[PDB]
């Protein structure tokens, strides 16, 4: 009861100053992303330097508070959040060396180029370069040369850098009273609670391994089906029982299998729901799209959007002497300022992205009453989950017909449901094994289990165990394959995408059950149902003031992550796949290899 009052006063002062010092930085960043000019870059840099210096000084000052003396949980949470700023609690020279390594990694990834084995006139890059040539083409050699060349350049030029990066990051992590840098990443999910509710940061490895065990039976069947359909486009290249070659997955790395849709359509005679023509005929613009999104959100009890949102936000390409960034983003600036930056157009994809971004802003507005240090998401992947559950119940035929973009006498087709489910499956299910494998590999390398001299020897060995892909040509230890990903050479964690997928389906089942709907889950819609809105706003207004095991309990009525709802979502596709795979063989043998 002696330092608790001091902590309260210190937190009050910090909250008063931080909002003012952060609004300027956010506003400068916004002014640069909507203008792009030499002066604006300097303004952004000088705005960010002040905030960084102030935050570092405040964290160093706040380090002098013994946590055991405090009783009140909220102040302890705020102080624990403020103290954890050991991203540069090292020596100066080591910090400069690490910054130089990171900068050279980023530059060498961005500026890398690949030249054709034949005439060197082409010498393409990644950009709209290699990405298109191996996202559209259906020729073996055309994909193979690019896939081999990109690795034989980037990995060769990146291996020593990553070798030094591992040890520097481990030193950084151990200086912060951790075990390794992988534990530093895993510490995001750690939470402390009163009545149980504790989530030790060592259990995640057990949890991620458990849930994946229940997704293997479904994925396996999908991995069979696609394989069959790949035996027609490339006849004499894929064994009936084995692993798919890496360079034939419709993407540079195999993160997504969406681009395999044209060759894997089960019913080509029935086209998907395309609504752009109706929008053009009816005379729609961007403003109408966003008013429709706002109406859908207010139909479930959530509040409207402020007049500042309409006044300030950029919603169309300015078509003036101004260059902008057209990556869609949702901005919260503090002091009640919310905006969207989107170069939106008249298409279904923009229509769904509007709902996604508007859900981001709804969550931000919901947690706007908490103190400043707790105005974040409840976890690393709650934001996206909340964003995607809104767009999930917006492309359903019921909602589209309910607003007039589809004929009123429309008849649902049983053959179309399978196509929609298959596209969703190739988008969603096909990415979980890749993320799990990559994160396990980085965790093992950081922990020191994998020797420095066997990295690739493990990377591929367990690649043809979980995801089920075989390399086209052998790679020596001089290679560094995983450095080619943007989420590896430039830091960033990679486990948020595994948690987001499961969270979104749990939330969707909870809300659609709370809205009293009977039938298939993928057809459920939450519009014009006030009951689901209050249940969602119950979690959305907490921020991270309470452990993430409590908001999940509030909404879905559980205390961990379960994959049963995901299995309910894809049940008809599971039955159809099982029916059509009853003659062929499921599973793969880890012995076949395209080389000798």
């Amino acid at each position: 009861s002696l330092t608790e009052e001091n902590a309260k006063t210190f937190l009050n002062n910090f909250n008063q100053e931080a909002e003012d010092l952060s609004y300027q930085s956010s506003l400068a960043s916004w002014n640069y992303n909507t203008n792009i000019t030499e002066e604006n870059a300097q303004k952004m840099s000088e705005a960010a330097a002040k905030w960084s210096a102030f935050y570092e000084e405040q964290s160093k000052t706040a380090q002098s508070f013994s946590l055991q003396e405090i009783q009140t949980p909220i102040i302890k949470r705020q102080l624990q959040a403020l103290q954890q700023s050991g991203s540069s609690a090292l020596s100066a020279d080591k910090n400069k060396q690490l910054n130089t390594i990171l900068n050279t990694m980023s530059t060498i990834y961005s500026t890398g180029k690949v030249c054709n084995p034949k005439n060197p006139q082409e010498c393409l890059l990644l950009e709209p370069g290699l990405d298109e040539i191996m996202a559209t083409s259906t020729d073996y050699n055309s994909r193979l040369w690019a896939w081999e060349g990109w690795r034989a350049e980037v990995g060769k030029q990146l291996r020593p850098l990553y070798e030094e990066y591992v040890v520097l990051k481990n030193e950084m992590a151990r200086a912060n009273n951790y075990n390794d840098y992988g534990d530093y990443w895993r510490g995001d999910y750690e939470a402390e609670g009163a009545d149980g509710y504790n989530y030790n940061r060592n259990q995640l490895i057990e949890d991620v391994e458990r849930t994946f065990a229940e997704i293997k039976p479904l994925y396996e069947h999908l991995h069979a089906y696609v394989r069959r359909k790949l035996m027609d486009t490339y006849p004499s290249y894929i064994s009936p029982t084995g692993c798919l070659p890496a360079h034939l997955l419709g993407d540079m790395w195999g993160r997504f299998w969406t681009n395999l849709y044209p060759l894997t359509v089960p019913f080509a005679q029935k086209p998907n729901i395309d609504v752009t023509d109706a929008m053009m005929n009816q005379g729609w613009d961007a403003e109408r799209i966003f008013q429709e999104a706002e109406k859908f959100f207010v139909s479930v009890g959530l509040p409207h959007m402020t007049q500042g949102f309409w006044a300030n936000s950029m919603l169309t390409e300015p078509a003036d002497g101004r260059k902008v960034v057209c990556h869609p983003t949702a901005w919260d600036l503090g002091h009640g300022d919310f905006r969207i930056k989107m170069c939106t157009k008249v298409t279904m994809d923009n229509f769904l992205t509007a709902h996604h971004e508007m859900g981001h802003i709804q969550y931000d507005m919901a947690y706007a009453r908490q103190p400043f240090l707790l105005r974040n998401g409840a976890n690393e992947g709650f934001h996206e989950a909340v964003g995607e559950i809104m767009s999930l119940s917006a492309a359903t035929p019921k909602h589209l017909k309910s607003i007039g973009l589809l004929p009123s006498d429309f008849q649902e087709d049983s053959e179309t449901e399978i196509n929609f489910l298959l596209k969703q499956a190739l988008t969603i299910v096909g990415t979980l094994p890749f993320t799990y494998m990559l994160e396990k590999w980085r965790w093992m390398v950081f922990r020191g289990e994998i020797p420095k001299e066997q990295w690739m020897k493990k990377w591929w060995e367990m690649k043809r165990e979980i995801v089920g892909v075989v390399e086209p040509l052998p790679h020596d230890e001089t290679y560094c394959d995983p450095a080619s990903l943007f989420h590896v050479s430039n830091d960033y964690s990679f486990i948020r995408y595994y948690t987001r997928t499961i969270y979104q389906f749990q939330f969707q089942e909870a809300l659609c059950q709370a809205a009293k709907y009977n039938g298939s889950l993928h057809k459920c819609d939450i519009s014009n149902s006030t009951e689901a809105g209050q249940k969602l706003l119950k979690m959305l207004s907490l921020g991270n003031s309470e452990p993430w095991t409590k908001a999940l309990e509030n909404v879905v009525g559980a205390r961990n992550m379960d994959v049963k709802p995901l299995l309910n979502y894809f049940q008809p596709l599971f039955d159809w796949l099982k029916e059509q795979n009853r003659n062929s063989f499921v599973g793969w043998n880890t012995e076949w290899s395209p080389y000798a």
């Binding site: 001091n6 002062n13 500042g308 600036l333 009640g336």
Partner: protein, 195 residues
Amino acid sequence: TNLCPFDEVFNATRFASVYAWNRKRISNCVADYSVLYNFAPFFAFKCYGVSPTKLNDLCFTNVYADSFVIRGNEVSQIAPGQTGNIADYNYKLPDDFTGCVIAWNSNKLDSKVGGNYNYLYRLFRKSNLKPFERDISTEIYQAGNKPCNGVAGFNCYFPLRSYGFRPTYGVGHQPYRVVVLSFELLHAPATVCGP
């Protein structure tokens, strides 16, 4: 007929900060409160024990007008019995109140692109304020035990802080102008009456 000077109270080029709140004594004039409804939609107009639309039927010895500028969310702290920052360290109303408050938006006049730093408020004080009491002191607050000899630093902070208004803020953070009218009837005839 000599009307009361309300026109010069609700109209002013520049108002006063919340901690240094102004107070005007109105006495010996005929008061027509019906001209108080000559502004934009009032955000707050609620009267405690005076029965509005009957202001023209009472007589009081003198009236006090107190004017200041505060944030949007703080307007609820200008009621009797409330607790917060403004109601504890800047401006507090007694439990037995007789009169009422008028609060309206002033975003078009008190907001600038770079920030308006001419409005200040108190954040730290040793003990709460008695009703109708003004503090203007600028002594550095001492929260810890070690004195810092009047220089800012750890465990001693500057009590006054600025609002910093901008036109792009949300409604709850835009500036609001508040005028409080306090009536009192005493054993000294009565000079403030109706038409």
